[PDB]
Design a protein around this ligand. Sequence first.
Ligand SMILES: [Mn+2]
Ligand SMILES: [Mn+2]
Length: 269
Amino acid sequence: ATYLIGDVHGCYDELIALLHKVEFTPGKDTLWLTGDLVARGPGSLDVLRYVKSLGDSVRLVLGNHDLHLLAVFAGISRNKPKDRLTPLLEAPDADELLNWLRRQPLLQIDEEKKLVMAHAGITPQWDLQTAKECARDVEAVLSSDSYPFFLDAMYGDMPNNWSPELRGLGRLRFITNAFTRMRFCFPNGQLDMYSKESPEEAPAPLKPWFAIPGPVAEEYSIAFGHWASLEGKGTPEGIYALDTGCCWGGTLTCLRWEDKQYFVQPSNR
Ligand SMILES: [Mn+2]
Ligand SMILES: [Mn+2]
């Protein structure tokens, strides 16, 4: 069976309880995770140890908190107490866990399931070939010996409009923002990097990225996490918003792909 779970955010107990509810069995089943494995919840260290141990039984995409953890580890960014990352950063296997984490994808594609995953979704300004190339380019910098320079460069809110002509720092920043921070778009597909509200709470003319017809969404189902204020609701056919806010006191959601059946684990608080 194939299971897809939204942002875990260090909620190790809820993750394991949900996997036991569906009797997840590595070697028979595959787990897809929308990223943001770490921060806010208490068990980021246990989450990373477990997800790394799954090997080929898990298909991960990196989220914005996963990249932020890497930036803290590399001395690029300051550790925020609220993120609760210190046990992971101080662990004796921190190097092993985080060198594994930075090698993971930003984008997963299964052609037989006609299924795409990324943390925030797929901007409507990208076709599939472009999304693949952009994921490959950022994955290459993150997996390289020089990844702290990219982590430092990734911070920024501009440019917010895609063009194949983008080069350099702006190209990489846009790619990172589209895969890991996107929520709202302007009508022309341009990213808005400020509003984090629900679609009904947002100011005009902002619309969800998935409300703008895009070439990927026209041919593939898209699963994503990230947008907790969406509460997993309000999406069109073929768009699966899996982040129901476990770390915020919401729920952890798991979708089984074969029958589109949902399983939910309440937050422990
Ligand atoms: Mn998140
Ligand atoms: Mn996120």
